[PDB]
Structure 1
Amino acid sequence: MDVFMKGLSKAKEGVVAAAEKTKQGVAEAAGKTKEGVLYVGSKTKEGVVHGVATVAEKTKEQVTNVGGAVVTGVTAVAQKTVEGAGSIAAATGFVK
């Protein structure tokens, strides 16, 4: 069972260059990501929201958030005169 290899697997005489995802100037709220996840035989239960019972009587104002994740803020980003953040991979093999 061979999974998520980067580079030579069961292999020979090889040259491999792998970059990887860059991020610059990114604003995220309540995001979910899953990379390289393996489930074998497993039993899994995620994110269930059950039985929210918001009630109100006669109130003048009312706000309610129920979530696996709640963001109500300000998440600004500002940049002036910025360079770089790049990812570089260089591989050299078997030259003469």
Structure 2
Amino acid sequence: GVVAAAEKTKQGVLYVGSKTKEGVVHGVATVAEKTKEQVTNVGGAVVTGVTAVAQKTVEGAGSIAAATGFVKKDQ
């Protein structure tokens, strides 16, 4: 004869900007099996494949994925 027994007898400050999660990317699972990509750029800008990116700027101009083809100022 086999016996198995188990028992459990269980008796019984301002915070102005304190705890903030700001500019956060947490938890990402990405899979790419067969992705062919081909880019031909002539005199401009090309931005591809920007993933899992975070930033926080204070008193400044912040851009994650920005592209400007050309800037010309002549006199």
TM-score by length of 2: 0.24
Whichever structure has more strand as a proportion of its residues is 2
Counterpart-to-counterpart distance in 2, 1:62 and 1:92: 20
For structure 2, the residue ranges without an aligned partner over 5 or more in a row are none
Tell which structure's C-alpha radius of gyration is larger. Answer: 2
Matching residue of 2:55 = 79
TM-score by length of 1: 0.20
Equivalent pairs counted in the alignment come to 72
For structure 1, the residue ranges without an aligned partner over 5 or more in a row are 1-13, 25-35
1:16-61 residue CA offsets vs partner (Å, 9 max, x unmatched): 999999999xxxxxxxxxxx99963743221110122221112212
* Percent identity for Structure 1 against Structure 2: 99
One of 44, 54, 66 as aligned partner of 2:42 = 66
The change in CA–CA distance for 1:42 and 1:22 in structure 2 (over 3 A counts) is farther
RMSD: 30.8
